[model samples]
Target: YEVVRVGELGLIGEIIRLEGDKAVIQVYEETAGVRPGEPVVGTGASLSVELGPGLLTSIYDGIQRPLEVIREKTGDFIARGVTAPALPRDKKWHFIPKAKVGDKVVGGDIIGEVPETSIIVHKIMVPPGIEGEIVEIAEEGDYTIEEVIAKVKTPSGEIKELKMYQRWPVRVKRPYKEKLPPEVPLITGQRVIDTFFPQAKGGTAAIPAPFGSGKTVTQHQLAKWSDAQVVIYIGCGERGNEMTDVLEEFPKLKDPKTGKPLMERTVLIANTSNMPVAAREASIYTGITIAEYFRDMGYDVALMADSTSRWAEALREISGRLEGYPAYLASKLAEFYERAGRVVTLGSDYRVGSVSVIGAVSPPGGDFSEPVVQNTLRVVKVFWALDADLARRRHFPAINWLTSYSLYVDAVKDWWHKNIDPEWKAMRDKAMALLQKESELQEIVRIVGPDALPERERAILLVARMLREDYLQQDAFDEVDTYCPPEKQVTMMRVLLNFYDKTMEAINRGVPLEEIAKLPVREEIGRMKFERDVSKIRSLIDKTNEQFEELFKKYG
Candidate 1:
């Protein structure tokens, strides 16, 4: 509500701080040539986004200006003082009324619907802060978003007009009935994440990694494969080249879930580092606001902000607040992440919605002790700490198993137990324990070498390698290996765990660990990730047990 219009250029700015009679305004544009005498206009309205049916597949800049439209108008370079409607004003949608005339409705009550995309229905709800009985409603016909479609009479005897879209301030959280616990996992088909470091449906995750460790790659993976119905990707202060990759490549990638263009359910915000510095600060807020709007529609939404450190730097530059007060930075980080949650919408339908936020933090020199990474970790539930050592070994995800942890594991354990494999939680725990043990054993190996360890301990290292190379390491470029579903993930882990269990048994029965390790089925266990058929993987478990029995008989 503190937005202001700065200078004659009509640049959009926000009043972030107030000191007695003076105010500090942060302009969201390049303030290159403004002088001392230029008039600053104060707009009573806050910085907000237009919520409507035309949001999907749209590419916008910071402040919600349509980037493509601005590009067409100014011929590639965005001209100063240029303004355009965020949503298409001339295009009309076929509005279908859900609530009849004379029906009592409150804020957030769905009054009508529009087919926003082939896969999604745009539910038009009453804007929060007011409620009334519908006196007149529009017929089923194509009409523009700005055109009035319904009228409501309040108890105060005042009539309110309703439209297909409404404006909401970006800084404000949309009202909801109640917040819910984070129970359901926002399953991204990535095996390491889904099985080990799972994120709940309304959770916040921080991918604080160094450069070249695949931060962008992981975000792209989530954007492509997360189970959320709507995706909001904000390229906030990343390289322009990276933003171009998303803009050019995303349209061609088909949605595996719906078999439609992936862009049909995605909204991209391209506020690259090369753009106006202040715009980068606004980009994150703009992206989340749009996400909340869709969340209010009862759709599970996922938002990815690629490298929020740049946004933090922008804050550092604008307010100079990060310099004097370090704790203020912590509060800001907490406020941003706290916005992610599952909640019941403020409507009579009792519908629930959620917003899952995954923010990437580019810590300087990949140092986790840095202030940005530390502050982010304090607020987010899941930490996917990317490792340079793992990446150097050619692991696709590069998520260090020992360092990364998910607080939502216990909360989401029931989901895997009920819907997926009952042993999923146990298998994940066993694999983690083995991986931890291997790290310690490796430290001992460096001191005394591998030949000094007992056969059982050496066998543990061997199985840990299988978990790392075969299960955790995925091929993003490969056609079949790119996306592994939940069942396939479970099957792969079960087979590896079964291999470890059999290896232990064979050794205990006096079978040489070397012979058990050299079995030909071991190679097939490594290749099980590429095979999409879970039944084939399960069969491999039986084949491994048979081979182990053969080895035990030979030794006896």
Candidate 2:
């Protein structure tokens, strides 16, 4: 609802309560020096956003306002006043009608198409909550988005003019459905995630870390390389320069998945740290709505936030009027996280799509006990706990495998078994067990030095060290090492597990642990990650297996 000017001119607010000519209005504007009895003129309208073509490759503010226009008008970040329509008002599109007049159709039905982008076709869908028979349809021609290219005659004899546009409340979910029990992985080129703690294509993952723990880089890596068809990067409440860096940098980088420019399949919603805190809170929902629109269109969508902590901080700032101890944040976090999942869409042909949500959380001083990180942990299936110690050591991802885990591991195990390898889970379990054992042994080694430990205990540290250096460590900048396919991932693990397997048997045959460490095959196993191709990766794994057998026989 529009609001009456009291302290702020032309400020809009909603009617929160009404008591016999006394209305309590919560203003969207910054309020100060407002006195009672100031008249409020109601606009008698609800809040909403216009959804249509021109959304792809466009950056929007938190409140569905175009940020570029705001910057052009104000030349500063304090965006106010009315935001212009993001879609160009006068630019014409070639509209092609699909259904002719007199065809009965309902909501969610696409009546026509316009070539919106080089890749996406803008489908003019029937407005939800309306059903009618097509009475008039425009011919194929060039026309603006507002031009009525089709008219639907309602069952009650009302002709509703329709265009290539939709208006939806950002607070509401654009009605959609999809398969439950999401079984597919997002296949991020990052080995640590794909191999150990994987999030499903429709799953939710959270990265909670201290400052400078590589959260932004990790988020960018997933956006650049994850095998999602479309990406919605919401830089909600992050640093202005950080958001600016993405605005300047992402378009130049090629999408590792499609080989096209990354921005070609991406949409950005930037409500940076310098913007209005109220808008920053709303930007997240705007992004979620856009992601659902594309996912409902039968495309795999991935939505990410640089850091949800700043987003929650915006809420904290905005809710300061509540005089502290506000109780709405936790449920909001649950609602947002619950929206993510793989499912079947309402479209014909049983169209299936998924929206994966990856939230980057920066807890103040890396305190996991904070409300934002704690609440996020409850809903997210995967928790990639970024470590200060790991980042201090310059680990690229710095994802603490010991602390992070995926609840979807059991859910996605069959996926690996069916597609990659049957032994995938067993090898992964063994490798992780070795790491756990190494941790336990390291505690002792730190207390009494490595020389005091037996050969087998020392061998556990050797294998664990190899797992960390070879299998887990990935370089996002390296072309070959960046995106590891599923088969290649399985092969790398096989090499590691095979070494662990063969070494045990060699020990039983009286081959010394010192002799096993000196084998040339060990170095080749570590270098398999930087190999030329999947073919070369396999050849190296195979050659290493053969050479390990040779060394065992010679030493045994």
The residue pairs that clash in candidate 1, if any, are none
Where model 1 places Cα greater than 4 Å from the true spot, the runs are 1-38, 68-81, 314-325, 363-371
lDDT of 2 by residue, 1-556 (tens): 2322211123233323221112333233333333234464333333456777778777777767676433553333433324477677878888889889878877777788877776566677787766888888889988887888788888898878888887776667777644579688888968889878998988998887678788767877888778887888887445545554555666687766656687778788876555555566667778888887777767789998775555666222342355443346776778877878777765434667788999877766456664665655568989888887898888768999899999888888899999889998888888889988888888887898887777777677888989998998888778788778888899888878878877777777777788888878888777888885677666765676676678766866
lDDT tens per residue, model 1, 45-112: 45678999899998887677776432443224332212578888989899999999989999999999
Question: Candidate 2: RMSD over Cα atoms?
Answer: 4.8
Counting clashing residue pairs in each candidate, in order, gives: 0, 5
Query: Ten consecutive residues with minimal summed lDDT in candidate 2?
Result: 15-24
> How close is each model in CA RMSD to the real structure?
4.9, 4.8
TM-score for all models, in order of appearance? 0.89, 0.87
Off by over 4 Å in 2: 1-37, 68-82, 314-326, 364-366
Question: For residue 137, what is the lDDT in candidate 2?
Answer: 89
* Each model's lDDT: 0.80, 0.73
